[PDB]
Design a protein around this ligand. Sequence first.
Ligand code: ICS
Ligand code: ICS
Ligand code: CLF
Ligand code: CLF
Ligand SMILES: [Fe+3]
Lengths: 510, 510, 480, 481
Amino acid sequence: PQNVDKILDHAPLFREPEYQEMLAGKAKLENMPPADKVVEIADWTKSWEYREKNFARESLSVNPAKACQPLGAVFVASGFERTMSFVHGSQGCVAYYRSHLSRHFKEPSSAVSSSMTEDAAVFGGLNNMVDGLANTYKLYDPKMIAVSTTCMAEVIGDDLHAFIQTAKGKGSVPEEFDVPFAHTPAFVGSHVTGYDNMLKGILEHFWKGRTPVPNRSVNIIPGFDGFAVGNNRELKRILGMMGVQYTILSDVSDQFDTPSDGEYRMYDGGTKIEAARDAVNADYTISLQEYCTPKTLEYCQSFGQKTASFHYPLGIGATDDLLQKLSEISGKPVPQELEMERGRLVDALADSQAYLHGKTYAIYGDPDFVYGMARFILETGGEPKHCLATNGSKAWEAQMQELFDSSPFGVGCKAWGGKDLWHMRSLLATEKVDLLIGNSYGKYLERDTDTPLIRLMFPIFDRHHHHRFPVWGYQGALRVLVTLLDKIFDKLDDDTIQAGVTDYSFDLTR
Amino acid sequence: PQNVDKILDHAPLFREPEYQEMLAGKAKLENMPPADKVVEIADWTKSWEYREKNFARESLSVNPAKACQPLGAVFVASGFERTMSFVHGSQGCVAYYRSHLSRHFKEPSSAVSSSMTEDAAVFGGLNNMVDGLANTYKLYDPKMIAVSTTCMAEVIGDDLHAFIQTAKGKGSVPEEFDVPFAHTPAFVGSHVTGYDNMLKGILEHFWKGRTPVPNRSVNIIPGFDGFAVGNNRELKRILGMMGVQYTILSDVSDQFDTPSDGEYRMYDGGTKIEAARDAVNADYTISLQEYCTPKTLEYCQSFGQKTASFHYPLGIGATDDLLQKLSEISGKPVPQELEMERGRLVDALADSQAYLHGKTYAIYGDPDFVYGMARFILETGGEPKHCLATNGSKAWEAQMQELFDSSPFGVGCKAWGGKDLWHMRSLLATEKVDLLIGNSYGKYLERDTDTPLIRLMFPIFDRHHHHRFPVWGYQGALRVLVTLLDKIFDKLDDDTIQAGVTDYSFDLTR
Amino acid sequence: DKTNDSAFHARLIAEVLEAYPDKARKRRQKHLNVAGQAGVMLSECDVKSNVKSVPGVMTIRGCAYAGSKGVVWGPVKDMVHISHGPVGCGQYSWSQRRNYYIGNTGVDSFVTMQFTSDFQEKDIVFGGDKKLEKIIDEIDELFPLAKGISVQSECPIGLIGDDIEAVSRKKKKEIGKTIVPVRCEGFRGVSQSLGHHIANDAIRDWVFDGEDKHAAFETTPYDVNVIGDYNIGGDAWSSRILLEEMGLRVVGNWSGDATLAEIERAPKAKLNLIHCYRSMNYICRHMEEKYNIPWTEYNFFGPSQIAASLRKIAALFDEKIQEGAERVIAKYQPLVDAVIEKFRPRLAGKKVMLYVGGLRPRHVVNAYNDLGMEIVGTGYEFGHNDDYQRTGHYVREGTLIYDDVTGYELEKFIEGIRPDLVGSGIKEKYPVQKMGIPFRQMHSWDYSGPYHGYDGFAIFARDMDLAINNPVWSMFKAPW
Amino acid sequence: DKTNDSAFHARLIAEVLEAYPDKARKRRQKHLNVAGQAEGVMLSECDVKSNVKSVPGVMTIRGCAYAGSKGVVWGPVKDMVHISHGPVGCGQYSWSQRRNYYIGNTGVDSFVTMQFTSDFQEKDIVFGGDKKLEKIIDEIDELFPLAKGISVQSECPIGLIGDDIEAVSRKKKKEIGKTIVPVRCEGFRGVSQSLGHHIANDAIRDWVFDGEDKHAAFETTPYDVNVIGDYNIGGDAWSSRILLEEMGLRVVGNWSGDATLAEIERAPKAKLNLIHCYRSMNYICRHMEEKYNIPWTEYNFFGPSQIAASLRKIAALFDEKIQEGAERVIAKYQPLVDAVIEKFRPRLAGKKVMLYVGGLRPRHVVNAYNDLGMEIVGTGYEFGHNDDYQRTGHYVREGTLIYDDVTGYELEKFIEGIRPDLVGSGIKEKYPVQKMGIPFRQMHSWDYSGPYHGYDGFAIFARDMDLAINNPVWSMFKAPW
Ligand code: ICS
Ligand code: ICS
Ligand code: CLF
Ligand code: CLF
Ligand SMILES: [Fe+3]
């Protein structure tokens, strides 16, 4: 029963006898399979026979770990000064893009739709653009409107450039007002592709047909990042200590971490519009995530920028490599406070490596996260046995394989590009691993296969505020390290907490 | 059996059938109580009848949460520039003080003993001091030697001042060389008392009979702190942003977090010897932990310093109060970057408060930790039902009660001074709470009473590197917050992970 | 310090209308109003509804796919629901609606999963029907306990002229399991609403339109279907216990915790108890024409409505069921009394603004009143004229009413009114909290619930209390 | 850089001696030496003075007699409550830090991982603590009724203030009918943990053996042994026992890891004492040969060479049947030994190890390191006696650097100089050594791993030395700029 002194919400409530009895009663008329049949098919789904068939799939995706392009577009556009994402297309999309981001950051996510309906299939979506741009500009006072497209607008084939010019012709926005656009078709690639497409679209808008006035500064693109808030602050702290001349292109770190102080800030922070315009002058542009920027880096290359791309740098080596590149670009040495942070991270790893050596992992997410995570794992003596990226290409699989080959703890490790979490389930069932590194969808894999989850990948929906803390840098590597160790110790205490049976090993000191 | 492809260490190994069978065989000849008798007494130990008797104890301590004074002495002395703790007394003490600290920080802890043996009971310990000081000085090149006492040296009554002067007379150390001393009797108070006694001893050494040349700066004493490494760095960051003129008296943040880079640093960082000497000039001295400093603040008052003492400031209000006091002292306003951090912490708390409101806690540790933790809990809408401090006085119980009365979520709450973790066990057994905040000894309470532990108090032996991260400040308050939430969410997923029985509530988004 | 609420709300309407360009202003002016003056009607909520959203205004609405896959179909536990089109829609809608169910997920139920055709460019160019055929085979192999499959069409499907109905006909024969193609592409309609109508008509056309199939089912004079309770946080379970205790038999609850068998049998019942009028009156109207099964509206939010509902429903049967109603109302009185005594002192006099989809913006009001709280503003994402009509049974004159409200308008109305509570969705939550105003999600129940029924009412009150009467608000202003 | 090891070690001895004042130097010069040529078989002679006062202020690694008594001998006895008698310190620091494993419900039928203390205040120092102890014993009787006995582990003040804990123990044993063992293990006695051992052994004799025989009902066999001095570190004594049982012996009691008071009480009924830790418990084994005529033998279960030699040596004391069992056990575990050696010897052979532990392990583990191709280039004891150094020459090669009661200064300088591939010592040595870029494994706690004894142990031992030496962290010490 319910009780006002100790109120039972859904979780404990439906375990009470009256509901257990009513639910048993309901089950008798549900025509669901009998309990012996469920056990049979459950065990079968964890079998090798099933894994061969599951991996024989050609058409069906089940539990993919990726979103569609416009999510990436909204994300990247949200890291520019007072910029509103305008997704030309159907509006249900925008409800979803926003909800998804909000559930992850526990923050507002602002975006608007051109609200194309069925008629736009016959007449095209011009009026939606013209009217939409007008209303978005008047209501939400953006400095820039960043147009992307839903899959309906792509199939219909609307000419965005023409539409935007028509809109300016009719006075929807000032003639000189900034309306960069990009095609972001959901049926190509994923959200990382939309990050790239929208970012190029923005840069092309400000750079088209200009001649650089070269400077020695570096543009840094962080890419699609669940940990954007802490990571970008760590990045800035690092760059500041080194004294590097830089511009971050797309910084959502303030936008998705505004204070609760009586005012709601629709926009906050961002790459300044003027800095985006002067970014064409930089001699370098580095991407922290290759797979978020290939089109954008090619475009930067078209203005004679030298380009470098990393893979979500996590841990000692990856950070070292980033710092060395920054040092090569800026001419500035790595300062002693950063060697200390480094030496202290090494110290943590050395103190704790008995618990990491030999551990086996499954890892999934965006291709760059997975590379960078797997690499960090190898530094610890761990084995990234099952690496998986639904949005991972063959070129990625080759890069992963090169990473595996660089270390003796790589023997046996595989990278599964274009596979999904139903595939991952069969891996975890048949070739057990100690730990799963992924995102909140991975809780279902924890449930189905008794493989504990560590959340280091977008989206994190069932934990709060992890995004506020870095994973990049030496500081961030230490957080990751402690996050692993905490999951590991803890599993050790749970393995040894049963009095007189297992608690011989319940050590006070570990 | 054992197997070289998957090696079984102690935990899985003794669960193998052959060892289970051999252990059953051993048990038959152990003459231990039969299993029905164990169940009977176990249940009895969790009863109210037992709790009345357990609380009727007058002489026996079981599982106290405190150490003895010299630990606090060694700790505080280790936060001065190239300072070696010299504990005059028996040497087994020093092995223990060092091991205890090392197991917590995963770091070296350096300290020496005068190595008093039985004969010192009849002849006194002079030669031990003279010879000891000589050898410590020549071998370990300290800038200062900080003498404390083990309980044997106290009982024997050695005159430390005389002995140290005799030592200088015989050329053990240079005449002007700094050898502050303090009586640190294990049989009075606890480790917090030795922190106070040794710190006073050090200050008295440099201050005795001098006249201040007043300045507007503030001496800050952090006290005995398991999180000294992150906290002192957070403290310094805050003070820097505010532009306060300060001196930290005893800063072990570098000493217990040296890098692993090929050199072993016996000493690193610390309050400079000169700054300790000029600290007498400050108009203010604030202690961040009252119960670590009453003798030291009284001494500072004897040079006309104004003093303030806090209770391990955790969360919004306590940090606000510290910042305001700093602002009052320095004349400088709180800068906007700190209002942002504050506003962001408030935002985290508001986003997440559904999971904190109504939660009930048991909390134990040093008196100031417990106060500060309980206070933070009340900000979240939690109830600090069982607060306990083995080293907590009646004056502390009154202060805790004033804290409880300040908020409607304090109604049930009690503060149990001078009780131990066996007492706490009976509280947890009879009046269940959601969560236990303590130290690693609390894992035994997790085992005995199914109350999950959160480790925010010295010592943390079974987790690694938590000390590297702050709990003070707005940043630290956000870590604590996320540490609570994470424990709460793990627990929610564990309550709901059993397929078809409890997983109706296994929400993807929380 | 002092205001007149009707006139202050009319001012707030005028303020927000000034921010629009003239074209958008003319379209929006008919969606905003103050309730005028007129069981019983308290007020008249005269506002235009269920038309195009205006472009670029930051509407809160979803699409027909949400209404069909997310709302009606996705909760059916023993079917695989194919999100047909590119990966997006099925990712965003994966496990976000807390339409609870008992099952082994992946094995005998498929709710908290994404099944998708993951359209690539080749699929847009050459069509996706050959892909769907292959998909269905692959589902049949790998999820053999699935009693059926639905094909939830995302935007491209209709735009490229794919024939999913041909495929469904073809594969139902081939595999002997029901296949339901739904034309819930987002470009259809203006909102989630049409997704409901389309989905309801898909139930009629591909589930009811078939053989036998449960001729073995024993009936009683007390058999009902509960239509349109999607079991949010177990809402339908805490509704069902009361209906059973009153003496009814619940043949099927649509569609929370529902199996295909339960839905298939709905024609065998004597009466449809419709909770969510908006999402499922369509199938109830069909069920009155074809089978002669009448429907009735009820409401299980708060003790007033639950009592009135239990009595209204029981009056449709006989003495025996009427006595059970009174027994259920009497049984739960100590609980109701205990909740009211604990929480009404803490909440009475507090002002609430609401914004939800198509039912809750009126349906929860009475439960707020049972705790002494007043609703000063309410509104629907996708209500129809008949939902606004019914809103006047619940809100007082002077209540600010807003249909398909914009981010701009809603922010300005919340800033102006400063209610004690806002009840709306995930995209509204965080800005409102940032303004220093308590907020409780009225879709997901903020990961709590149930709120339906008596066991629900306690939890509902606890939740509104814990959001409003919390120490966090006093700490917004820094002390300097 | 080429070197001669014996002469390099002698140089390192000279370097460190130069850092001391003359008085400390004269005392320390006799504790440091290089193993000479020899005067089973003796490999070398480890001529070093031992078991005397530590020099003040030098950063000795030694503990006190309370460690030796409460921490080492007594505290592992599972079904007794051990009172740490004096102020709160000693019992806090020693609480659950030695991994002397046991099966029990802790708090209920066993009391190992707990601190029981009299928590001496100033009133207790001034007016004596005996009245407090009496009250404490009553309180233990009430609240831990399944405790079959109580020990009173004296901390420094007890003897200094003239408290009579023996009077109290006599009085309360009559009053509550449960054994009470007062131990005079105050830290001011002796020079180290060693005297704590002798004192604790003599307390077993005087307050457990000295009583009405509690077990006249015990059925004996010709194959009954006690295992004496294996404290079950990470389950070491359990992996030792399975081999002794499989060989055909019956283990009456294992002292004192996983031990009950009953098992200890019965030790006189056995036919033979198998002593592993010679240092801690030869005392009670000598008593048991004089009083009961039960002979003792030394064995060693670190690594396959020693385990085989030990199983055979022990079996040769019985008959044909037990000798055949030895061979069966050695044969049974050969595939395991072979597998460990093939996996891990290639990864460890040729690597140089320095050791420093208490009283047994500094020699006893050497042969297991050699079974993996590793050489010991330095070893030493906290509190070894002359007879431990004597026996060390059965294990270490000539030219091994030997250090008794080594100082922090000396040990740091020897590790910096030798740069071994591994150091095996304690918690207070671990972290500095890792900071120097040198792998380290704890040779007391087994770094929270184990067991290392026996065959099942040897696998885990090899895994652990491999994972500390052969891991990627070392290559990352030098930053790439
Ligand atoms: S179905 Fe409708 S928007 Fe009636 S689409 Fe929506 S689970 Fe709302 S006001 Mo989300 S017509 Fe249900 C609804 Fe109401 S998803 Fe839920 S809360 S009672
Ligand atoms: S008892 Fe002794 S110091 Fe023989 S006091 Fe010490 S668990 Fe050492 S070398 Mo810690 S004489 Fe045991 C020992 Fe050896 S605690 Fe352990 S490892 S084999
Ligand atoms: S109205 Fe259309 S049915 Fe509705 S939710 Fe939008 S797409 Fe889908 Fe967007 S999110 Fe991406 S771009 Fe196409 S696939 Fe899915
Ligand atoms: S040689 Fe003496 S028996 Fe040995 S460990 Fe030292 S005290 Fe104890 Fe120190 S730690 Fe404190 S001061 Fe006394 S109480 Fe316990
Ligand atoms: Fe937020």
